[PDB]
């Protein structure tokens, strides 16, 4: 079944895979993160309550005073988004934080408080995220791009480089928290284990063991295991564990109970271990050579006097053995060491350790971290504790603690956010085992080691950054001075917090402008996964690993949507279905295969959980019950794919789209293109300028509608109902009954957006698609946005194309365009620029605004009014005055030539100079809007009074329209009340509407529903007047301009740019190219029916760039256009709705095994007519991304029309009429138009304005500047014999200040000589080197 | 071997003097104020830690820390210069005024690149304190009109004093985030004419001289000394009356005649008032 928006034009679908999950709402990331951020979270988990309960309470410097936090609340924005986009201010809301200042009493450590005082204070102003994921910051519209950073917690990287000149690998742990100091444990090439803290110098890692109050016997006891020896008065006997001989060598006879197991020269195999575990021997004998190198475990004092025979971590020598025995010791502990299983790395590092006590370890860390200054007893351990064990300066996360305890295999997933002793000891033991072989290194690019920060996370971090400075200032205010009974309204300065959060949202790395020249460009700007910014790497030191794609990206991050250039694969785009975890790693849905069938329990699997199972593919055929068709089905287990048995699998993919992003889910026949051209197509599809009248994709993808709906560019109905009235700018829906809430009388008013500019200066404009009296439903699209058509994405216009080389005019990537394209105005985009004119308060006096400007004639002053601003609708062009601004000046002291001139003409001098806002050169538009701002107190002129009168009349009419048409709906529902239980069919119509809501009924709810709609209408009666006075004082008030500026006049030109040679166009597959000739209609080749083809394209760009998908896009375009012309022929003559139903149903039947069987017998002969009128330009065809349209279906489509199955017809030539040999491929490629418009690119400067310090020209096209003749071009000129060209180029075209006026006067006096001199930049270099102590002089 | 930065060396150095008791301070000042330099050296050398303590609070203004410390040192030297032990007071109370005020005047002087005077900076700090207290009453940024309301001062005065709080930007900072474009690439040398206006002036000068020699001699000498043009000085009609032609009215007459001839000569070349003045 279909909605009433789909009975208009139902797009034919070639999807064969039956879909299971819908495409989720594409803007969930930004909206959900900011909803977590600004929310009264009752527990301290998310956003503001978490940040406040983190940093608060602040107490004084033990000054018996503490500032605590109670609760916060957010204000209402004084400006909604439209008024604040006009006004240029942010769209923010203020947080009135309720605080309380407590005062602990004296002689009261935890005694009571003598004085508490609660006071609701203000601080900061958080910009609210609008209903689409954008902010308004200073009039603009910014999108906080989500960041993918490395997950906090332990990270056992290796080295795996040479880095040694021997090739040994050196494993290093690294403990990243969300906030705090780092910690590594790197190995040394001599198998020394070296800690380092925040990448300072390497110190031996047992120092920090001693700093945790560990003696050296405990340091040995953790990391090693015991071999208790034996003295039976001699024989050096040994308590044996048989598995200690794993790979060892017996140079003696290992003999026990007089039984031989291993011998000299026989190495200890596991067979001897089997003999030993058969014999169960505890104590053996080993010779005197055995304990010659064993390192003792504890301090063995003397038996008699307690003198140290041997301290711990000392190798036992034979004289040490004799001294230990003659003292009287019998049992000796030592360490089971080995060069294979238990390397004595802690023992060797303990030897190289120059420390002996805990206090000396603290002193050593103090002389490492904060060097030079000597420590106290206290300051050393205080620094060390505040490093890793303080809730204020160390915090892993909940995420960091989860990744930590999951990386060292703990059962908990939560705990203390700071470290502990066993945490560091476990990281050390795991690193040691990773050295010995057991355990493998991680990788950073794996997306189980990479989070997603978003607007909520980074905004809360900035809020914490503001609050720690407010904590510093509050501790400064509290302990110093007084106690006081002072209130907590002056101890907190609003401007630091506002400064921090505005510095984030205004200009961070990730606070970027919304590239607003599509719907698609808006969505793929919001769904951006960038790895730059704070806490992220830069482009200069981004190695070839994070640029690369991973086997974990599948289903999370698009592999073909990343901008090429310096940041390839750092600005990744999120996949379609790719959700985000609780913690933040990108999880992706999978539907669980049970025993043998694909149950639809759609589970979202994260990255590390994906790495276990065996996930099938979306192209696995299902036998309509759930089982796989084959008995072995391809899949992927752990990165690598395989071919596993069909019972072995554990999950199946959700849909064919889940790897690619939303941008790359719009290219038809994606899988036929190469990955490079698919990348360029995805990158170029989000720069398409929305044209004059956007068409359709005749070859679509089905994600057109979801992308169009799921952006904020269109107007979708919220409650379904009958359309009551549609104007060109407003829509009035009357709500259906059951979907209407009983309080209001529902008439939804959708006011569209008309002809306002984008960020890229295009025309963001909404035109209604519905008609009057049409029933629409919930979620139905009412008004197309920009680049939309009936709620489908239409970025470009589909044109009849042909692939043949035509006379060289389409040589490399150039593109012919027939003149009938520009007659039809298919690509005539509208650009709306904004010009401004501030009227400051200079010290000479105020710059006025009037239309009496000196030294300009009437020819420019015709277009302004008497108030100095131009008329709305005036066709202005290059150089004309928009806003005439006179500026005062003084001390003219004219040169006598101008004195003689003004005396010849009798002209007066002008004390006011002219700084009028004139149009820039080249742009010729139509002035559609003048917005006049005024500082309060300044007098409005006639124009601003006229505009305020107009805006007030518009707002009063707006509130009267809402009250009156709401009154119409109110008395309509009152009449619907008045047709039941006391029905007065004419008596209600007899007395007027004063008493319709006061009419006598029965004792039902409808009697006090007449009074409910009555008090509704009296509420509206007071609301109209109060909101009217609100809007009136909001209009007529002053403005919040900058200091010093009086009035700002914005004038909005609107240019309707055509297309021309120079303009860049592109297909959807990387088939770009600047168009090159506007060929006429006759010269463009025609097929044998008369139709000239519209765009001639070069064939040789196909098989080298391998975007073979566009050949099939062209063929299916020809198929769909053949169907459109067949229906148009059946509609030209009035055939019948019956035969039309027969043909359209036959067109929807083919091909084989597709979903959406659409049965046209349920269409009621008006929607067949209305469907035919929409299909008549071409039946739109959905070809999903990797579900595709197989070519036999295209051949059957081409045989449904009369077209030839090759897709290749006999084009005839244009200028001769001789038929082309070898017949050519014509069809309908959906061509785009990019905004690399040649009028924005073309620029030339003869002589303009030179820069300040060095007299050289300026930058490109905005300051009217010369092209840079960089050093490579200098080498190119030196590589010829060209000396004079190079000399004049860097002397007199550019820099010699006295030289180039002589050059110009030589030119205009007809003599091309040059008197070069010496460039000014070299004099600058002279005075700059010489402004050190360096006498550099030119000598002769 | 100390690590050789200036702050650590100084802060380690200043502890090498025992802090003085009250009778000790009074005796040292008694010796100091009669001209014994060792007593001055002991009094200033001991209370350096007071200067670091006082100037600790004035951190994170425009001046760096050691600048604040060294400027407090000057006031401390002023304080021992004018301390009185005869009031019996502890020295810290009297020196606190001098050190606090001579760091306050330091921040008022050496912060802004365009040096505002003292009273302008105190007047601006009055308004900023008023705005900080006014922001908690209306929970938005108080306007220039709002501060002018709360202090009942004229709105133009508060607007001027807030515009004198401009926070003068750098030039060398890049624009647009990307480090390719600072203000040197944006700013244009506005006083220096390019070659176009510089050749228009020279061509206009030669054209003026040519047209003047196209005019007869008695007219052009009046019009030359009248404007100082043809190698002359710009003289008065009374002056060239006594110098060349005794009737000042006839000098005005020949000036109007020469101006009419030059009007004809200019308009023969098509240069009218619309041509030269748009």
DSSP A498-519: HHHHHHHHHSSSSEEE---SSS
The gap from C-alpha A1113 to its chain's centroid, in whole angstroms, comes to: 31
- Among B132, B161, B188, the strongest candidate for a mutation testing the A interface, having the largest count of A CBs within 10 A, is B188
- Among A904, A938, A1267, the strongest candidate for a mutation testing the B interface, having the largest count of B CBs within 10 A, is A904
* Residue in A75, A1252, A1301 nearest the CB of B189: A1252
Beta bridge partners of A1107: A673
State both tokens at A1173: 């009128």
Q: Does A75 touch chain B (CB under 8 A)?
A: yes
- Among B229, B231, B277, the strongest candidate for a mutation testing the A interface, having the largest count of A CBs within 10 A, is B277
Q: Does B136 touch chain A (CB under 8 A)?
A: yes
Residue of A nearest to B205 (CA): A897
DSSP state of A11: P
Nearest to A128 by CA among A465, A481, A455: A455
Beta bridge partners of A643: A634
* Residue in B143, B190, B263 nearest the CB of A1040: B143
Note whether A157 and A444 are within 8 A (CB). Answer: yes
**Distance from C-alpha of A659 to C-alpha of A559, rounded to nearest angstrom:** 8
Note whether A948 and A1035 are within 8 A (CB). Answer: yes
State both tokens at A304: 């008699």
Q: Does B249 touch chain A (CB under 8 A)?
A: no
Dmax (CA) of chain B: 100
Interchain CB distance below 8 Å, A96 and B139: yes
State both tokens at A868: 């100095």
DSSP state of A1222: S
**Experimentally determined by:** cryo-EM
Beta bridge partners of A918: A881
- In three-state form (DSSP H/G/I as H, E/B as E, the rest C), the secondary structure along A376-437 is CHHHHHHHHHHHHCCCCCCECCHHHHHHHHHHCCCCCCCCCCCCCHHHHHHHHHHHHHHHHC
Q: What is the total residue count of chain B?
A: 278
- Among A896, A1257, A1264, A1310, the strongest candidate for a mutation testing the B interface, having the largest count of B CBs within 10 A, is A896
In the numeric block, the tokens 């001579």 are attached to: B102
- Which residues of B fall within a CB distance of 8 Å from A856? 278
**Distance from C-alpha of A88 to C-alpha of B240, rounded to nearest angstrom:** 62
Q: Environment class of residue A1173 by beta-carbon count within 10 Å: exposed (0-12), middle (13-18) or buried (19+)?
A: middle
Note whether A31 and A452 are within 8 A (CB). Answer: no
Residue of B nearest to A1255 (CA): B189
DSSP state of A886: E
| For helices B248-268 and B217-227, angle between their N-to-C axes, nearest 10 degrees | 100
B window 186-205, beta carbon within 8 A of A? 186-190, 192, 194-196, 198-199, 201-205
Q: Does B159 touch chain A (CB under 8 A)?
A: yes
Instruction: Quickly list DSSP for A1178-1200.
Output: ---EE--TTT---HHHHHHHHHH
**Domain A830-947+1046-1056 carries which CATH code?**
2.40.50.150
Preceding omega of A457 cis (within 30 degrees of 0): no
Residues A1291-1309, buried b or exposed e (16+ Cβ, 10 A)?
A: bbbbbbbebbbbbbebeee
In the numeric block, the tokens 């063929």 are attached to: A1115
Note whether B186 and A1263 are within 8 A (CB). Answer: yes
Q: Is A391 helix (H, G, I), strand (E, B) or coil?
A: coil
State both tokens at B113: 């690149």
Q: Where are the beta strands (DSSP E) in A1010-1144?
A: 1045-1056, 1064-1066, 1072-1079, 1095-1097
Note whether A449 and A442 are within 8 A (CB). Answer: yes
Q: Is A542 helix (H, G, I), strand (E, B) or coil?
A: coil
State both tokens at A1106: 């391998």
The gap from C-alpha B206 to its chain's centroid, in whole angstroms, comes to: 42
> Strand A146-147 relative to strand A529-530: parallel, antiparallel, unpaired?
parallel
State both tokens at A758: 């984008």
Q: Environment class of residue A403 by beta-carbon count within 10 Å: exposed (0-12), middle (13-18) or buried (19+)?
A: buried
Nearest to A209 by CA among A219, A222, A217, A223: A219
Interchain CB distance below 8 Å, A905 and B3: no
In angstroms, what separates the C-alpha of B220 from chain A's closest C-alpha?
Answer: 12
Residues B242-252, buried b or exposed e (16+ Cβ, 10 A)?
A: eeebeeeeebe
Resolution (A): 3.3
- In three-state form (DSSP H/G/I as H, E/B as E, the rest C), the secondary structure along A936-989 is CCCCCCHHHHHHHHHHHHHHHHHHHHHHHHHHHHHHHHHHHHCCCCCCCCCHHH
* Residue in B189, B208, B229 nearest the CB of A1251: B189
Residue of B nearest to A860 (CA): B278
Nearest to A421 by CA among A223, A216, A217, A211: A211
Q: Does B154 touch chain A (CB under 8 A)?
A: no
Q: Does A280 touch chain B (CB under 8 A)?
A: no
> Strand A1181-1182 relative to strand A699-700: parallel, antiparallel, unpaired?
parallel
> Strand A1208-1209 relative to strand A1224-1233: parallel, antiparallel, unpaired?
antiparallel
CA atoms within 13 A on the CB side of B184: 9
- Which residues of A fall within a CB distance of 8 Å from B188? 1249-1252, 1258, 1263
Q: Where are the beta strands (DSSP E) in A486-584?
A: 511-513, 529-530
Interchain CB distance below 8 Å, A1258 and B186: yes
Dmax (CA) of chain A: 136
DSSP state of B178: S
Report how far apart the first and last C-alpha atoms of chain A are (Å, whole number).
95
- Which residues of A fall within a CB distance of 8 Å from B190? 1249
Beta bridge partners of A590: A603, A653
Give 3-state DSSP helix, strand, coil % of chain A, rounded to 5.
30, 20, 50
Q: What is the total residue count of chain A?
A: 1340
- Which residues of A fall within a CB distance of 8 Å from B271? none
Residue of B nearest to A94 (CA): B139
Which residues, 6 or more positions from A63, have their beta carbon under 8 angstroms from its beta carbon?
A478, A479
> Strand A254-256 relative to strand A259-262: parallel, antiparallel, unpaired?
antiparallel
Q: Does A439 touch chain B (CB under 8 A)?
A: no
CA angle centred on A253, ends A248 and A256, rounded to 5°? 100
- Which residues of A fall within a CB distance of 8 Å from B213? none
| For helices A48-55 and A455-479, angle between their N-to-C axes, nearest 10 degrees | 30
Q: Does A233 touch chain B (CB under 8 A)?
A: no
The gap from C-alpha A697 to its chain's centroid, in whole angstroms, comes to: 27
* Residue in B3, B196, B228 nearest the CB of A371: B3
Residue of B nearest to A902 (CA): B273
A window 1021-1060, beta carbon within 8 A of B? 1038, 1040, 1043-1044
In angstroms, what separates the C-alpha of B95 from chain A's closest C-alpha?
Answer: 18
Note whether A217 and A378 are within 8 A (CB). Answer: no
Neighbours of A155 (CB within 10 A): 21
- Which residues of A fall within a CB distance of 8 Å from B194? 1247-1250
**Distance from C-alpha of A528 to C-alpha of A572, rounded to nearest angstrom:** 7
Interchain CB distance below 8 Å, A1249 and B189: yes
Beta bridge partners of A187: A193
Neighbours of A1228 (CB within 10 A): 24
In angstroms, what separates the C-alpha of A1252 from chain B's closest C-alpha?
Answer: 4
Q: Does B162 touch chain A (CB under 8 A)?
A: yes
Give 3-state DSSP helix, strand, coil % of chain B, rounded to 5.
65, 0, 35
């Amino acid at each position: 079944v279909y909605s009433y928006t789909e009975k208009k034009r139902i797009r034919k679908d070639f999807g064969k895979r039956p879909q299971v999950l819908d495409v989720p709402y594409l803007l969930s990331i930004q909206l959900d993160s900011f909803q977590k951020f600004i929310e009264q979270d009752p527990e301290g988990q998310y956003g503001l309550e978490a940040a406040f309960r983190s940093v608060f309470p602040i107490q004084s410097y033990s000054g018996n005073s503490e500032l605590q936090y109670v609760s916060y609340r957010l204000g209402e924005p004084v400006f909604d988004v439209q008024e604040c986009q006009i006004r240029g201010v942010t769209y923010s809301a203020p947080l009135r934080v309720k605080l309380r200042l407590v005062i602990y009493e004296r002689e009261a450590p935890e005694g009571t408080v003598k004085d508490i005082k609660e006071q609701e204070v203000y601080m900061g102003e958080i910009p609210l995220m609008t209903d689409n994921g954008t902010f308004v910051i200073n009039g603009t519209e910014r999108v906080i791009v989500s960041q993918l950073h490395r997950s906090p917690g332990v990270f056992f990287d290796s080295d795996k480089g040479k880095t040694h000149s021997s090739g040994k690998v050196l494993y290093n742990a690294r403990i990243i928290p969300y906030r705090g100091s780092w910690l590594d444990f790197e190995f040394d090439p001599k198998d020394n284990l070296f800690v380092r803290i925040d990448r300072r110098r390497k110190l031996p890692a047992t120092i920090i063991l001693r700093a945790l109050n560990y003696t050296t016997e405990q340091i040995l006891d953790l990391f090693f295991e015991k071999v208790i020896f034996e003295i039976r008065d001699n024989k050096l006997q040994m308590e044996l564990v048989p598995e200690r001989l794993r790979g060892e060598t017996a140079s003696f006879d290992i003999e026990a109970n007089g039984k031989v197991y291993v011998e000299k020269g026989r190495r200890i195999t596991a067979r001897h271990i089997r003999q030993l575990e058969k014999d169960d021997v505890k104590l053996i004998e080993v010779p005197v050579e055995y304990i010659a190198g064993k390192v003792v475990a504890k301090d063995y004092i003397d038996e008699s006097t307690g003198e140290l025979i041997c301290a711990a971590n000392m190798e036992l020598s034979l004289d040490l053995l004799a001294k230990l025995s003659q003292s009287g010791h019998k049992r000796i502990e030592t360490l089971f060491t080995n060069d294979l299983d238990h390397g004595p790395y802690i023992s060797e590092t303990l030897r190289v350790d120059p420390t002996n006590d805990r206090l000396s370890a603290l002193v050593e860390i103090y002389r490492m971290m904060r060097p030079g200054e000597p420590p106290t007893r206290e300051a050393a351990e205080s620094l060390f504790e505040n490093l890793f064990f303080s809730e204020d300066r160390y915090d892993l996360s909940a995420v960091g603690r989860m990744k930590f305890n999951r990386s060292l295999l703990r059962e908990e997933i939560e705990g203390s956010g700071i470290l502990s002793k066993d945490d560091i000891i476990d990281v050390m033991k795991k690193l040691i085992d990773i050295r010995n072989g057991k355990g493998e290194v991680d990788d950073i690019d794996h997306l189980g080691n990479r989070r997603i920060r978003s607007v909520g996370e980074m905004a809360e971090n900035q809020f914490r950054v503001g609050l720690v400075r407010v904590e510093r200032a509050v501790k400064e205010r509290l302990s110093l001075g007084d106690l006081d009974t002072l209130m907590p309204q002056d101890m907190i300065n609003a401007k630091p917090i506002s400064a921090a959060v505005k510095e984030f949202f205004g200009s961070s790395q990730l606070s970027q402008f919304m590239d607003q020249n599509n719907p698609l460009s808006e969505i793929t700007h919001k769904r951006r996964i960038s790895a730059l910014g704070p806490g992220g790497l830069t482009r200069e030191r981004a190695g070839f690993e994070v640029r690369d794609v991973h086997p974990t990206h599948y289903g999370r991050v698009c592999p073909i949507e990343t901008p090429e250039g310096p940041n390839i694969g750092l600005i990744n785009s999120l996949s379609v279905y790719a959700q985000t975890n609780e913690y933040g790693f990108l999880e992706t849905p999978y539907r669980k295969v049970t025993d043998g069938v694909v149950t639809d329990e759609i589970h979202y699997l994260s990255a590390i959980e994906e790495g276990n199972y065996v996930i099938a593919q979306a192209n696995s055929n299902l036998d309509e019950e759930g089982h796989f068709v084959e008995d072995l089905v391809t899949c992927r287990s752990k990165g690598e794919s395989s071919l596993f048995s069909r019972d072995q699998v554990d999950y199946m993919d959700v849909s064919t789209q889940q790897v690619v992003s939303v941008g790359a889910s719009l290219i038809p026949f994606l899988e036929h293109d190469d990955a490079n051209r698919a990348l360029m197509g995805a990158n170029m599809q989000r720069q398409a300028v929305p044209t004059l009248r956007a068409d359709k994709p005749l070859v679509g993808t089905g994600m057109e509608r979801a992308v169009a709906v799921d952006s904020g560019v269109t107007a979708v109905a919220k409650r379904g109902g009958v359309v009551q009235y549609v104007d060109a700018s407003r829509i009035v829906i009357k709500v259906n009954e059951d979907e209407m809430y009983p309080g209001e009388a529902g008439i939804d008013i959708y006011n569209l957006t008309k002809y306002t500019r984008s960020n890229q200066n295009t025309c963001i404009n909404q035109m209604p698609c519905v008609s009057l009296g049409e029933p629409v439903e919930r979620g139905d699209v009412l008004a197309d946005g920009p680049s939309t058509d009936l709620g489908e994405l239409a970025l470009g216009q589909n044109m009849r194309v042909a692939f043949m080389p035509w006379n060289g005019y389409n040589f490399e990537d150039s593109i012919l365009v027939s003149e009938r394209v520009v007659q039809e105005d298919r690509f005539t985009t509208i650009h709306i620029q904004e010009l401004a004119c501030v009227s400051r308060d200079t010290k000479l006096g105020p710059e006025e605004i009037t239309a009496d400007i000196p030294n300009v004639g009437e020819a420019a002053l015709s277009k302004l009014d008497e108030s100095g601003i131009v008329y709305i609708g005036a066709e202005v062009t290059g150089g004309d005055i928009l806003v005439g601004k006179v500026t005062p000046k003084g001390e003219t002291q004219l040169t006598p030539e101008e004195k003689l001139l003004r005396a010849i003409f009798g002209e007066k001098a002008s004390d006011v100079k002219d700084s009028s806002l004139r149009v820039p050169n080249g742009v010729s538009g139509t002035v559609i809007d003048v917005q006049v701002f005024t500082r309060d107190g300044v007098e409005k002129d006639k124009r601003a009074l006229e505009i305020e009168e107009m805006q007030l009349k518009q707002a009063k009419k707006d509130l009267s329209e809402e009250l009156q048409i709401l009154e119409a709906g109110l008395f309509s529902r009152i009449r619907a009340v008045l047709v039941a239980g006391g029905v007065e069919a004419e008596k209600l119509d007899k007395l007027p509407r004063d008493r319709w809501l006061e009419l006598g009924l029965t004792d039902e709810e409808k009697q006090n529903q007449l009074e409910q709609l009555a008090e509704q209408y009296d509420e509206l009666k007071h609301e109209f007047e109060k909101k009217l006075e609100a809007k009136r004082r909001k209009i007529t008030q002053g403005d919040d301009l900058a200091p010093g500026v009086l009035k700002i006049v914005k004038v909005y030109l609107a240019v309707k740019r055509r297309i021309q040679p120079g303009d860049k166009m592109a297909g959807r597959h990387g088939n770009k190219g600047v168009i090159s000739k506007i060929n006429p209609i006759e010269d463009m080749p025609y097929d044998e029916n008369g139709t000239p083809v519209d765009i001639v394209l070069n064939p040789l760009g196909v098989p080298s760039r391998m975007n073979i998908g566009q050949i099939l896009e062209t063929h299916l375009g020809m198929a769909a256009k053949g169907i459109g012309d067949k229906i148009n022929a059946m509609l030209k003559q009035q055939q019948e709705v019956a035969k039309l139903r027969e043909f359209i149903q036959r067109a929807y039947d083919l091909g084989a095994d597709v979903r959406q069987k659409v049965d046209l017998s349920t269409f009621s002969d008006e929607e067949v007519m209305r469907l035919a009128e929409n299909l008549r330009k071409g039946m739109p065809i959905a070809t999903p991304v990797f579900d595709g349209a197989k070519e036999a279906e295209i051949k059957e489509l081409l045989k449904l029309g009369d077209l030839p199955t090759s897709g290749q017809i006999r084009l005839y030539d244009g200028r001769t009429g001789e038929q082309f040999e070898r017949p050519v491929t014509v069809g309908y490629m959906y061509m785009l138009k990019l905004n690399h418009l040649v009028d924005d690119k073309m620029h030339a400067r003869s002589t303009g304005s030179y820069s300040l310090v060095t007299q050289q020209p300026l930058g490109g096209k905005a300051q009217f500047g010369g092209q840079r003749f960089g050093e490579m071009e200098v080498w190119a000129l030196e590589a010829y014999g060209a000396a004079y060209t190079l000399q004049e180029m860097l002397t007199v075209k550019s820099d010699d200040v006295n030289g180039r006026t002589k050059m110009y006067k030589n030119i205009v006096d007809g003599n091309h000589q040059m008197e070069p001199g010496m460039p000014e930049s070299f004099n600058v270099l002279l005075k700059e080197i010489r402004s050190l102590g360096i006498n550099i002089e030119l000598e002769d | 071997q100390r690590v050789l930065d200036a702050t650590q060396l100084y802060l380690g150095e200043i502890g090498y003097s025992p802090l003085l008791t009250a009778e000790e301070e009074v005796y040292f000042a008694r010796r100091a104020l009669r001209g014994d330099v060792a007593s001055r050296r002991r009094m200033i050398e001991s209370n350096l830690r007071l200067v670091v303590k006082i100037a600790r609070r004035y951190g994170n203004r425009g001046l760096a820390l050691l600048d604040l410390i060294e400027e407090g040192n000057l006031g401390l030297i002023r304080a021992v210069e004018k301390f009185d032990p005869e009031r019996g007071f502890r020295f810290s109370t009297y020196a606190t005024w001098w050190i606090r005020q001579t760091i306050e005047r330091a921040i008022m002087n050496q912060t802004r690149t365009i040096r505002l005077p003292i009273h302008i900076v105190k007047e601006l700090n009055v308004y900023l304190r008023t705005a900080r207290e006014l922001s908690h009453k209306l929970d938005h940024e108080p306007s220039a009109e709002e501060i002018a309301e709360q202090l009942d001062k004229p709105v133009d005065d508060v607007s001027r004093m807030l515009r004198l709080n401009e926070r003068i930007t750098s030039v060398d900072t890049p624009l647009g985030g990307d480090s390719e474009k600072a203000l040197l690439d944006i700013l244009a040398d506005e006083k220096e004419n390019g070659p176009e206006d510089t050749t228009q002036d020279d061509d206009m000068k030669q054209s003026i001289v040519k047209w003047l020699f196209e005019l007869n001699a008695k007219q052009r000498e009046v019009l030359a000394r009248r404007f100082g043009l043809l190698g002359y000085e710009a003289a008065t009609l009374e002056d060239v009356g006594r110098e060349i032609g005794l009737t000042r009215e006839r000098v005005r007459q020949i000036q109007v005649e020469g101006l009419r001839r030059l009007r004809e000569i200019l308009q023969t070349q098509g240069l009218n008032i619309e041509a030269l003045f748009r």
